[PDB]
Every structure is written in structure tokens, then in C-alpha cells.
Amino acid sequence: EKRPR
Amino acid sequence: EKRPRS
Amino acid sequence: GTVNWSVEDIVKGINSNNLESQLQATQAARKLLSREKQPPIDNIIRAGLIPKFVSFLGKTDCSPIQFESAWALTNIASGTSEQTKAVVDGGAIPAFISLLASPHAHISEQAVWALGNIAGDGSAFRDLVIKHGAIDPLLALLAVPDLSTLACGYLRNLTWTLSNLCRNKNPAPPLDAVEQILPTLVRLLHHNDPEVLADSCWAISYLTDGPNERIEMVVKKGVVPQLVKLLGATELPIVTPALRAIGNIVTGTDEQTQKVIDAGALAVFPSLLTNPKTNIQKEATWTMSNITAGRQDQIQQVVNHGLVPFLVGVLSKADFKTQKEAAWAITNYTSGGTVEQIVYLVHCGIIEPLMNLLSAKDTKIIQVILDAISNIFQAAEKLGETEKLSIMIEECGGLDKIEALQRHENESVYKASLNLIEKYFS
């Protein structure tokens, strides 16, 4: 899945 | 960020 | 004669109740606070001078003492949080906002600068500056048909202060303030000055560093194409915040990610993924990993743009933190991709640099890589070609790595490494 910073 | 005026 | 005063002399002049003696002492304070080597900020504070400086901001009859006290307070506010707090505690915020309406450009600019330092301290002072009503008079200073008629340094200071009003999280800026500021940010994003462009990009990068609703407010203003154009700039101070903003946007929905792709961003990534600046390569690879976590048609555009060999490149040689983002990009690719896309990935040479990174003493990248191997084997099962992949992994020394990892210390490293050997190497 997406990984925020 | 902060900036002084020199 | 205002060069190198003592703090004691400055106090004496300011307490004289002679406006001109006060003006000269304040200028002497400004020159003290303007020196590179350790300006005596704390001694000025402890002398009790901040309330007097703040009071001088309201002397509309003596514009020079307004300027000198504004400058002195700006440099105090540029220090530590405790030093900024001393300025705020002296009542400076409403006094600086009133100075935004000064007819003297050099005075209103100093007020812009000071509020930028105060707002840039943190979300509390940022929101306090907003509650005192700073946004309307700030944006009013930019209500001209053509920004090029404004003094360059003046415009750069306004942009920087607006970016500090967009800065910081927990909490993010008020939604109403962001909507009020955004149309001016979009205009500054199209200005021709490299420093205005950099700070505009920074502001956008702050606004997109949040949940999808925050990202959506920015994307709906139609700035992604301009961000992509700035991605291709030659100035590193512009590329860095532009790339951070683009990377933030692709942490959102697949539809928001599609806007980045539709704007042509992938065509810049050959350069970004080989950029000599380590931070650019890391950010670009991180951005790629969030694009390979999208839909299969988005993985396909990564393929069509020829970016898989560049991912093989960064996995093969890069700063370790970049290689870690490359591993994530591969695992996301193999988790969401079709069989054909995963086959293409192996054909481009992903296996050997994947195996080489199992020597890394970072337990998370090991799990990431082991996951990707599992995902690749799963696509090989659907082709009945798990044997040839097992030979590939053995031929490059990966099998020796994977079974060294069954003696590993961290749990799911050894569980996953046994499962691989039990199932494909046994």
C-alpha cells in the first residue's frame, strides 16, 4: 500500500 | 524556517 | 555613532523619553542584532526592551523608529522558540499586522518578514497570527495585475511568509486559511523568479503533506501540471520542493496519482532516479514506490516510460536509503502487478540486485525483499516456471543468502525464509 512520508 | 535580516 | 553600543547604553537611550535619542538607541540595537557572531538577543530580552520596541511600532509619526524597531524585533523573532515567544509575549503580532498597511514599502516588508518568523515557529504561533487577521492584509499586498511590478525582494519575502503560514502539522493550518491562500499560491507558482518558485513549491509541499482531503484541495486548483514543469527545472532549490509536493500527492488516492501521471511526471524520472543529489534520488524512488503501489494500468505507465531499468539501476547501486525505497517499489510492483508485468521485471534483471541486498543488516528491507521474492514466485507458479526462478536465485548466490536468513534473529524474517526454501528449494 501507499506509504506517507 | 526563520530568517534574520543581516 | 550607533555602531557597537553596549546594552546598557541602548537601555539608557530608550528610557530617555527623547524620541530622537530613542531612535538612535533602537538603531544601535538593530545593528547589534544584525551581527553574524552571537547577537546578544537574550541580553536585549532581559533588559526589558521588547515592549518598548513593540510600542515604537505604533509611532506612525516617526517612520524611521518604526523601521528600526521592526528590524530589531524581526531578528529577535528569528531565534529560538523562547526568543520568538518573547516577541509574541510583547504584543508584537497585532502591531506587525497594523504595519502591513504602512505606506512605506520597507516598513511593511519588515512586518511581513517578522510575521514570517513568528508563524514559522510552529503551529500555535502560526494559528495565532492567523487569528489576529494577518492573511487579508498579506494577500492584499499581492493584489496587483502583474507580480513583476513588485520589488523582487519584497515579493520573495511575501512568498516566504505565506509558505510559513502553510507550514507545520498537528494541526495542519485551518482549512479556511488554506482555501484563502491557495489562489495566490497558484499565481506565485507561475511567477518567473527562482526564489519565489522555490518557496511557492515548499508551501504546496506543506499543504499536500496530509490526508487525501488536503491533497484534494491542492490538486483541484489544477497546479499538478505546473508542479511537473518545475520538476524539470535546472535549479535544485526548485526541483527539491516540487518533487516533495509530487511525492506527497501520490500518497493519496489512485485518482490523485493519475493526475501526476497524466501531467507527464514519469518522463522526468530517468533524470531524477540518476540525479547526483542523494536526496533527489531517495525522494524520486520513494515517489516511484507509491506509484507502483497503484493500479495495474499505472504500473503499466511506469513500464511504458522505461522506468523499470531505472529501478533495477537504483536497486543495484545507490545510497542505502535509496535502495530501501527501491525495494519498496519492487515489492509494491510485484504485489499489485499482473503476471506479465512481473515477468518483465525479472527479464530486466531485478533478481540479482534483490539478492545482493539481503546482505543488508536492516531487518525491514529483508522482509520487504522476501515479500517480493514470494510475489515473484507466485507469478512463476501460474506459469509453472518456479524451477527456472529457483535456478536464477541460486546462480547469483541468493539461495545461500535466504538460508543464512533462517538463522536470523527477527521472527518473520526466518519464518518467510524457511517457507521459501521448504516450498521452492526443496
Classify A5 as helix, strand or coil. coil
Q: Which amino acid is present at C389? A: L
Nearest to C114 by CA among C138, C149, C142: C138
Question: Is C116 at the interface with chain A, CB within 8 A?
Answer: no
CA distance C413 to C370: 8
Q: What's the structural domain count of chain C?
A: 1
Question: Is C289 at the interface with chain A, CB within 8 A?
Answer: yes
For chain B, the residues whose C-beta falls within 8 A of a C-beta of chain C are 1-6
Q: Which amino acid is present at B4? A: P
Method: X-ray
Chains C and B touch, contact meaning at least 3 pairs of CB atoms under 8 angstroms apart: yes
Q: What are phi and psi of C95, to 5 degrees?
A: -70, -35
Task: Give the C-alpha distances (Å, rounded to integers) separating C379 from C250, C279, C339, C375, C385.
Answer: 26, 33, 5, 7, 9
- Asked whether the beta carbons of residue A3 and residue C293 sit closer than 8 angstroms, the reply is yes
The DSSP output letter for A1 is -
- Asked whether the beta carbons of residue C251 and residue A2 sit closer than 8 angstroms, the reply is yes
Judged on CB neighbours under 10 Å (0-12, 13-18, 19+), C7 is: middle
Residue C363 corresponds to which cell in the numbers above? 531487518
Question: Is C290 at the interface with chain A, CB within 8 A?
Answer: yes
Q: Which residue of B has its CA nearest to C76?
A: B4
Query: Which residues on chain C are in Cβ contact (under 8 Å) with A1?
Result: 293, 332
- Asked whether the beta carbons of residue C78 and residue B1 sit closer than 8 angstroms, the reply is no
Q: What is the 3-state secondary structure (H, E, C) of chain C?
A: CCCCCCHHHHHHHHCCCCHHHHHHHHHHHHHHHCCCCCCCHHHHHHCCCHHHHHHHHCCCCCHHHHHHHHHHHHHHHCCCHHHHHHHHHCCHHHHHHHHCCCCCHHHHHHHHHHHHHHHCCCHHHHHHHHHCCCHHHHHHCCCCCCHHHCCHHHHHHHHHHHHHHCCCCCCCCCHHHHHHHHHHHHHHHCCCCHHHHHHHHHHHHHHCCCCHHHHHHHHCCCCHHHHHHHHCCCCHHHHHHHHHHHHHHCCCCHHHHHHHHHCCHHHHHHHHCCCCCHHHHHHHHHHHHHHCCCCHHHHHHHHHCCCHHHHHHHHHCCCHHHHHHHHHHHHHHHHHCCHHHHHHHHHCCCHHHHHHHHHCCCHHHHHHHHHHHHHHHHHHHCCCCHHHHHHHHHHCCHHHHHHHHHHCCCHHHHHHHHHHHHHHCC
Task: Give the C-alpha distances (Å, rounded to integers) separating C21 from C14, C198, C200.
Answer: 7, 42, 42
| Resolution to 1 decimal place, in Å | 2.2
**CATH number of residue C165's parent domain:** 1.25.10.10
Query: Which residues on chain C are in Cβ contact (under 8 Å) with B5?
Result: 34, 71, 74-75, 78, 110, 113
| C171 upstream amide cis, omega within 30 of 0 | yes
Q: Which residue has the cell 547577537?
A: C39
Q: Which domain holds residue C104?
A: 1-426
Question: Is C206 at the interface with chain A, CB within 8 A?
Answer: no
Look at the alpha carbons of C215, C216, C222, C225 in this order and tell me if their dihedral is positive or negative. Answer: positive
Judged on CB neighbours under 10 Å (0-12, 13-18, 19+), C206 is: buried
Å from C126 to nearest chain B CA?
Answer: 12
The DSSP output letter for B5 is -
Question: Is C33 at the interface with chain B, CB within 8 A?
Answer: yes
Yes or no: say if C164 and B3 are a contact pair by the CB < 8 Å rule. Answer: no
- Asked whether the beta carbons of residue A2 and residue C290 sit closer than 8 angstroms, the reply is yes
Q: Which amino acid is present at C236? A: L
